[PDB]
């Protein structure tokens, strides 16, 4: 039962690689940690601008280890004024089971991977990236994002409680996109992000006609 | 005659590890820095002072006695790990309490420089030699409380000196005594634990006892996984197919168990093979993986069944 260190991983364009910890939290058996990279279409990329090494490794029961996300110079074919999307997976391979009729299940994490160029390299401080522009239309809001960064909005509501607790189908907004989402009109709205570091903040808004900026 | 002297730099500084999940391991960097290093221990068995008349051989070695473990003021105990040591030589696995990093600068340097060969405790010199930074990455238990931390970590750091009469001088401070030296240099470490969810750490086998030949047609069994959590969280679960099934079920998810037998695998009562567990408030939640068997006499075959699946968690 190996697992990752973080929910989501941000690749710095300045740097050549990065290490992600894994750990075999099962202490009775050894496991193999298959690790790989996928493109924005969630397909495998084997020579791809980013690669993960090693593709497989034995973790002895209880043993913690790493994986290395890294670059190939076909990264220069990527756009440098905005993040590009990948996903880093990890699949546990169990010891083939003792002989009986048995269905064997295998956990696999699949986090997001953000190639972020050096040109758009964020402040060490959690930078805002708060510029967002909820526009009212029939059926709800249409959320603008003219930042050069990927942004997953996890909730929308009337208050900080509703955004935190209330049901909502999560949406990831590509950099420089506008997208319609279904929601009741709110006099004062509240959108809940997921920041680089992983925690879920809440932005609060001020609606001046159709356009609603943050407070 | 052999003569040993040590100085402790007593460096002070802080490092922001920033916001991390409980499973994430934050980091800090223990820089060696020049400064005014005070003597705190020595072993002298030769001339007190040095003059121009007679030569003597040298050996200078660095030291950083960094503690293996620390406990937060909250009372929870942190664990430290060596991410990147550098050209430093760690030289003591056997002892549990502290790491022992050291570096030999000089060895058999035949010098005539007159001055003090045994500065007694309380005296000082201006050390002006650089070394690599030693990086540390910290381990946090799941029970760590959420919020801001400020763990003050004491350590010793300093340059051992060895003036000698004999050629091929080889004298080093013992590890036991190195531990007892004043931990004059320590650097505060600040980090923030946002917290995060972690699934159950166990074998996921689902067992059916009897082959039963044909009779075990629609046999059922299932098993459950805990998924603990500190904060609010969405975890999209998706059963994935490894072993390709023999028969076809329309929108139901299926897996080949071999010998013309499938398992329609489900998760929280879902034949579709995808669910979503959500956390508004903290605490664990169970995830129930059904295996329903299925075969048909046309291709029923005697033999031991086994298949597999991959319950994929798409953490957004």
From Swiss-Prot, chain A:
Gene that specifies this protein: papD
Compartment(s) of residence: Periplasm
Main subcellular location: periplasm
Assembly and oligomerization: Interacts with substrates PapG and PapK.
GO CC terms of this entry: outer membrane-bounded periplasmic space
Disulfide bridge positions per record: 207-212
Organism of derivation: Escherichia coli
Family in the record: Belongs to the periplasmic pilus chaperone family.
Keywords: Chaperone, Disulfide bond, Fimbrium biogenesis, Immunoglobulin domain, Periplasm, Signal
PROSITE patterns: PILI_CHAPERONE
Function of the protein: Binds and caps interactive surfaces on P pilus subunits to prevent them from participating in non-productive interactions. Facilitates the import of P pilus subunits into the periplasm, probably also facilitates their folding. Chaperone-subunit complexes are then targeted to the PapC outer membrane usher where the chaperone must uncap from the subunits. Coexpression of this chaperone with individual, otherwise toxic, P pilus subunits (tested with PapA, PapE and PapG) suppresses their growth inhibitory phenotype.
InterPro entries: Ig-like_fold, PapD-like_sf, Periplasmic_pilus_chap, Pili_assmbl_chap_C_dom_sf, Pili_assmbl_chaperone_bac, Pili_assmbl_chaperone_C, Pili_assmbl_chaperone_CS, Pili_assmbl_chaperone_N
General remark: PapD donates its G1 beta strand to complete the Ig fold of PapK (donor strand complementation).
Domain of life from the UniProt record: Bacteria
Cross-referenced Pfam families: PapD_C, PapD_N
GO biological process per UniProt: cell wall organization; chaperone-mediated protein folding
Protein name: Chaperone protein PapD
Keyword Calcium: no
UniProtKB/Swiss-Prot annotation, chain B:
Subcellular location(s) of the protein: Secreted; Fimbrium
UniProt effect for mutating residue 170 to A: Abolished receptor binding activity
Superkingdom of the source species: Bacteria
Keyword Disulfide bond: yes
One Pfam family it belongs to: PapG_C
Any one GO CC term of the record: extracellular region
Key words of the record: Disulfide bond, Fimbrium, Secreted, Signal
Any one GO biological process: cell adhesion
Key word NADP present: no
Disulphide linkage map: 44-118, 197-229
UniProt-annotated binding residues for D-galactose: 59, 104-107
Entry GO MF terms: carbohydrate binding
Effect of mutating residue 107 to A: Abolished receptor binding activity
Family: Belongs to the adhesin PapG family.
Other notes: Strains of E.coli that cause infection of the human urinary tract produce pap-pili (P pili) which are hair-like appendages consisting of about 1000 helically arranged subunits of the protein PapA. These pili mediate binding to digalactoside-containing glycolipids present on the epithelial cells which line the urinary tract.
Protein purpose: Tip adhesin component of type P pili that plays a critical role in kidney infection through targeted interaction with the globoseries glycolipids containing the Gal-alpha(1-4)-Gal disaccharide present on uroepithelial cells. In turn, transcriptionally regulates host gene expression in kidney cells, leading to inflammatory pathway activation and renal tissue damage. Acts thereby as key determinant of invasive uropathogenic E.coli (UPEC), which cause pyelonephritis and urinary-source bacteremia.
UniProt name for this protein: Fimbrial adhesin PapGII
Native organism: Escherichia coli
Lineage, highest ranks first: Bacteria, Pseudomonadati, Pseudomonadota, Gammaproteobacteria, Enterobacterales
